[PDB]
C-alpha cells in the first residue's frame, strides 16, 4: 500500500464514498473515527473496536504529552505498539485544548499550559511523530464562538502560518515524511470571506487532506450546516475533508450531504457509559425504569454482538448498579451502531440513493 | 447428564482430583469459582470468564435480591439467561451477610435486614430457586471470629436446625429438587468437638455437597489450616467439599492439601483492579513506578490472552489513569492466573506429584 492515496468511487451531489490507502491499512469513506484520547477507546479492547467495524482511531497529541508521555511512548515502540491497535491512527495536535483550556500563554511562537509544558507547531509534530501516528493534523488554533469578524481573522492568519511551519516540521523529518500523511485545518469561524482566504492559503502549502476545524463548538446546527455550505467547496475536491468534533447521527448525515468524508466524536463512548444508547428509532436511556423488565436488545435491527446477546433490562441493571460490563456493553454497542450508519451512508451513496436514506433515516430517527 | 454426579479420579494423601457432572455442565476439581456478585463478574463478559478456564461462578443471594431483585430475574429467565452465563452457577444464602451486615434483627425464624427483607431458611432457598441456581447453599449462620466455645456452640446448633430447614425447603420444591443440588454448611467456629457435631448433623441430613463455613473471617492461615486439618476428614469423603471465600493462592494450595475441591474469593477479581497482579513470583502491584516502562506481560509463562499482547507499561498507564481497559485486562489476567494454578493443582494430583507441586510452587512464590 502507499504512503497515502484517496480514491473516490461514487459521488451523489456533494456526498462520496471511496477509500483511503495508506500503509497501516484502507479506510473506508466516509468514515467514523472512534476517539482514544488516553491510548484507549474507553471500555473496549482494540479487538472489538475493529470488530465493530472502525478502520482508523482517534489519539490526541495534548492529553499523551501529559500522560504517559510523547517520548515515553516512543520508547516503548510507539502509540500503535503500546496499546495494541496495528491500523491507522490520526492525531489531533492539540490545537483544540489551546482553546478550551485557554492555564495557557498564547504568542505567534505556540502556546504555554501550566508542571508547564509547551506546544508549538514543531513540538506537537515532533510529538505525533513520537507517537508514530498515521495520520498528522497541523498545529492550529480553534477559534471560539461567537468570534468577532476582526478576531476571527487574526486568529486564522496565525493558524494559516502555523499551518505553513506545520508543513515544513513535517517534511523536514524524512521517515514522517514518507510514512505518515498531514492534514491543514481550516479556520475563519462562521464567516465566508475568511473560509475562503483559509481555504487558499492551505492549498497553496499543500496537504494530504483538509479538515474544516473551529465548528462544533456551540454554534448550532442550522450554523453548522450553513458554514459547510459554502465552506467544504473551498477545499480541494480530491482530497479527504474532515469534520472535527462532529458529531450526533443527525449532523454527520447532514455533513456527508455537504462533502464530509471524515467523523469523530466522543459521543457513543462518553454517553454510552452514561447509559444513552442510539438506536433507529432515537437514542434511549437504558437508565429508565421503563427498561427494568425490557427483554429486547437495545436496538430491534443492530447487528452487534451486545444485541445478539443480552438485553435491555441486563444493561439497565448494570448501569444502575454502575458496573464496568454496563459501560463496556453500551460502548461496543454505541460504536457498533454509528459504524452501521457509516455502511449505510456509503452503500447509499454507491448505490445513488443516498438522498431518500437520509430522509429516511430523519423520518424514523426523529418520530 | 445427572443432576449431580461427583467422581475421584486421582488422590494424593488428602488432596484428590476429579469432576462434578451436573445438568448445565462438569466442574473440574479443585475449582475455582469467580465471584458474580451483581449478576457480572466484574469487567468481564462470560465469554471471557469462560476462556479464562472457569466452569462455573459464584452468585449472591442477598445481593440479588436487593438488587434486581429475585422475582425480576425470574421473570426474566432466570439468572443463567439474564447475565449470559449458561453453566453451572453457585449461589450463596445470604448466611455471611447474616453476619457481616449485623441493620439485623436475628431470631430462630431468619433475619430480617434493614426499606426491609427478611431472609430465612425457606426464602433463601426459594430467591435461590427465583435464580435457578445449579448449587444452592443451605442458610446458615456465619459464627463471628473470634467466637467463645458457648457462643460457637448456640450459634452452630441454629445453623443445623437452619440446615434441616433448608434440606426439607428444597426437597419440597420438585423443579429444583430434580435440577439442583444442595450444599450443607458445617460450622462450630475453631472447636473440633463443635466442628463433629456439626459434620455429624450435616451427614445424617444429607447433601450433595459439604462447605466448610465460619474460616476465612480473620483468623489467619495457622488457624485455618489447623481447623481444616481436623475439619475435612469430619466430612463424607465421597462427596465435594468446598471452602468459602478461600483464598489467596497459597491458602488455595495447603487447603488442596488438606481435603478442599472448591474454592471462591474477590481477590483476583477486586484486587485486579486496584492494581494487584498475580505471577508466579508473587504479586506485583502493577501501580509501582518501576513498571512504566517495563515492556514484560504481567508474568512471563502466563498463557492469557492479556500477557500474549499488553506491556505491563501499558497496562501501568491505564491503571494509573483510572481507565475502564485496566481493570479489564487486570481481572482476565488474575482469573487466568487463578485457572492456571487450579488447572496445575489437578494435573499435579493425578500425576502424583501434587506435594513436590507445593513445595516448588511456595519457593518460586515466596522467593
Ligand atoms: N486542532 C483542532 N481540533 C479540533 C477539535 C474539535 N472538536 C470539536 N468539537 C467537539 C469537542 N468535544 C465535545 C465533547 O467533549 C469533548 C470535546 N470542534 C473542534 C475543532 C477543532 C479545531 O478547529 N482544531
Ligand atoms: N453462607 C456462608 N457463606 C460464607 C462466606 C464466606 N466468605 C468468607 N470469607 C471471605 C469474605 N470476603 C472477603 C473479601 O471481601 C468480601 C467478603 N468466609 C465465609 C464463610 C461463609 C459461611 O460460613 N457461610
Ligand atoms: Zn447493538
Ligand atoms: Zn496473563
Same mark, same amino acid.
Given at each position: ?204 502549502? /499543500? ?8 465548528? $462544533? +463548538?456551540?454554534? #448550532?446546527? @442550522?450554523?453548522?450546516?450553513? =458554514? &459547510? ?15 472535527? /468534533? ?8 447532514? $455533513? +456527508?450531504?455537504? #462533502?464530509? @468524508?471524515?467523523?469523530?466524536? =466522543? &459521543? ?100
Amino acid at each position: 500500500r502507499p504512503r497515502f492515496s484517496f480514491s473516490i468511487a461514487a459521488r451523489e451531489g456533494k456526498a462520496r464514498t471511496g477509500t483511503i490507502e495508506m500503509k497501516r491499512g484502507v479506510i473506508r469513506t466516509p468514515a467514523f473515527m472512534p476517539v482514544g484520547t488516553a491510548a484507549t477507546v474507553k471500555a473496549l479492547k482494540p479487538e472489538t473496536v475493529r470488530a465493530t467495524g472502525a478502520d482508523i482511531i482517534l489519539g490526541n497529541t495534548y492529553h499523551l504529552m501529559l500522560r504517559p508521555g510523547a517520548e515515553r511512548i516512543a520508547k516503548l515502540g510507539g502509540l500503535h505498539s503500546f496499546m495494541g491497535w496495528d491500523r491507522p491512527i490520526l492525531t489531533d495536535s492539540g490545537g483544540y485544548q489551546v482553546m478550551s483550556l485557554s492555564l495557557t500563554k498564547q504568542s505567534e511562537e505556540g502556546v504555554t499550559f501550566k508542571s508547564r509544558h509547551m506546544l508549538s507547531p514543531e513540538r506537537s509534530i515532533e510529538i505525533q511523530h513520537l507517537l508514530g501516528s498515521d495520520i498528522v493534523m497541523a498545529f492550529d488554533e480553534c477559534t471560539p464562538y461567537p468570534a468577532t469578524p476582526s478576531r476571527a481573522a487574526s486568529s486564522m492568519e496565525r493558524s494559516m502560518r502555523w499551518a505553513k511551519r506545520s508543513r515544513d516540521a513535517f517534511d523536514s523529518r524524512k521517515e514522517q515524511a514518507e510514512n505518515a500523511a498531514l492534514f491543514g485545518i481550516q479556520q475563519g469561524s462562521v464567516f465566508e470571506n475568511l473560509r475562503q482566504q483559509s481555504a487558499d492559503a492551505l492549498a497553496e502549502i /499543500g496537504f494530504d487532506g483538509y479538515a474544516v476545524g473551529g465548528l $462544533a +463548538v456551540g454554534e #448550532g446546527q @442550522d450554523e453548522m450546516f450553513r =458554514v &459547510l455550505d459554502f465552506s467544504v467547496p473551498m477545499l480541494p475536491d480530491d482530497k479527504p475533508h474532515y469534520l472535527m /468534533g462532529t458529531g450526533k447521527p443527525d449532523d454527520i448525515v447532514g $455533513a +456527508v450531504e455537504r #462533502g464530509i @468524508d471524515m467523523f469523530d466524536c =466522543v &459521543l457513543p463512548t462518553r454517553s454510552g457509559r452514561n447509559g444513552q444508547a442510539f438506536t433507529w428509532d432515537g437514542p434511549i436511556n437504558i437508565r429508565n425504569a421503563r427498561f427494568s423488565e425490557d427483554l429486547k436488545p437495545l436496538d430491534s435491527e443492530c447487528h452487534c454482538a451486545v444485541c445478539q446477546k443480552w438485553s435491555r433490562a441486563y444493561i439497565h441493571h448494570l448501569i444502575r448498579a454502575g458496573e464496568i460490563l454496563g459501560a463496556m456493553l453500551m460502548t461496543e454497542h454505541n460504536i457498533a451502531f454509528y459504524q452501521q450508519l457509516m455502511q449505510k451512508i456509503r452503500d447509499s451513496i454507491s448505490e445513488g440513493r443516498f438522498s431518500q436514506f437520509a430522509q429516511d433515516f430523519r423520518a424514523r430517527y426523529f418520530a
